[PDB]
C-alpha cells in the first residue's frame, strides 16, 4: 500500500510527506500519533491528525483519559484511527522542552513492536524538542516491525537520509 518510500533498513522506510495526507491516502492499519500523556492534541502531528478527524480523535481521547488517567511518558494506547487508519497508536515520546528523559525515547519506540506495520512520525522530533537524527537512530535500533516514517520537513528529510549510517 505504501509508495515512494526510501528503504533505510530491513524494516524501516522513510518519505518526505505530510502524515495526515499519507494516512488519508493509504488508510493504514495503524497510524502513530505523537501524543502527550494527557492526549491533548493541540499542535504538531497530534494537532494535525486530530483536526483531520474533525476533533473526533480529541473527543475519544478525553473519554479515554476520564476512564484511565494519563499515559506514562514512553507509553501508548490504541484508539480508533477514525477516517485516517483502522487504529491510532498514541505514543508518548519524551518532550525535551518539558525536561523529560531522552532515554525514554527507546521505551516509546518499543510500543511499535506490538504492530506488524505502522505509518509513523519520528518520535520526540518537532515540538517535542529532541534531535530528529537521534530519533531516527533510536527508531532503527529499536523497532523490528515494518515502520513507514513520514517526515514533514523536506530539508530535515534530506538531512536524515544523507546522514544515515
Ligand atoms: C517533526 C519533524 N521536524 C523537525 O524535527 C524539525 C523542526 C522544524 C522542521 C524540522 C518533521 O518534519 O517530521
Q: Does an H or E element contain 30, and which?
A: strand 30-34
For residues 95 and 157, give the distance between their C-alpha atoms in angstroms, rounded to a whole number. 21
The residue with cell 506490538 is 114
Per the structure, the count of domains in the chain is 1
Closest residue to atom 4 of ligand 1, CA basis: 126
Experimental method: X-ray
Å from CA of 69 to ligand 1 middle: 29
For residues 84 and 27, give the distance between their C-alpha atoms in angstroms, rounded to a whole number. 6
The residue with cell 504492530 is 115
Residue range(s) defining the domain that contains residue 18: 1-165
How far is residue 141 CA from its own chain's centroid? Answer: 16
Query: 4, 40, 46, 47: which is closest to 22 by C-alpha?
Result: 4
| Cell output for 30 | 495503524
| Cell output for 38 | 494527557
Phi, psi for 147 (deg, rounded to 5): -115, 125
Query: How is 41-101 classified by DSSP, letter by letter?
Result: --SHHHHHHHHHTTTHHHHHHHHHHHHH-PPPTT-EEEEE-TTT-SEEEEE----GGGT--
Are 34 and 19 in contact by the 8 Å Cβ rule? The answer is: no
Å from CA of 30 to ligand 1 middle: 21
93: left (phi over 0), alpha (psi -120 to 50) or beta: beta
Residues 6+ apart with CB under 8 A from 138: 105, 106, 109, 123
Using CB distances shorter than 6 Å, the residues near ligand 1 are: 121-122, 125-126, 132, 151-153, 156
Amino acid at each position: 500500500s505504501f509508495s515512494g518510500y526510501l528503504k533505510l533498513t530491513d524494516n524501516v522506510y522513510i518519505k518526505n510527506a505530510d502524515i495526515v495526507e499519507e494516512a488519508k491516502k493509504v488508510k493504514p492499519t495503524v497510524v502513530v500519533n505523537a501524543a502527550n500523556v494527557y492526549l491533548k492534541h493541540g499542535g504538531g502531528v497530534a494537532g494535525a491528525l486530530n483536526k483531520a478527524t474533525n476533533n473526533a480523535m480529541q473527543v475519544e481521547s478525553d473519554d479515554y483519559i476520564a476512564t484511565n488517567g494519563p499515559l506514562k511518558v514512553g507509553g501508548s494506547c490504541v484508539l480508533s484511527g477514525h477516517n485516517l487508519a483502522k487504529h491510532c497508536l498514541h505514543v508518548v515520546g519524551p518532550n525535551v522542552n518539558k525536561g523529560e528523559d531522552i532515554q525514554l525515547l527507546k521505551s516509546a519506540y518499543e510500543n511499535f513492536n506490538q504492530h506488524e506495520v505502522l505509518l509513523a512520525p519520528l518520535l520526540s522530533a518537532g515540538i517535542f524538542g529532541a534531535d530528529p537524527i537521534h530519533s531516527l537512530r533510536v527508531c532503527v535500533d529499536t523497532v523490528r516491525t515494518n515502520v513507514y516514517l513520514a517526515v514533514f520537513d523536506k530539508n530535515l528529510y534530506d538531512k536524515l537520509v544523507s546522514s544515515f549510517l
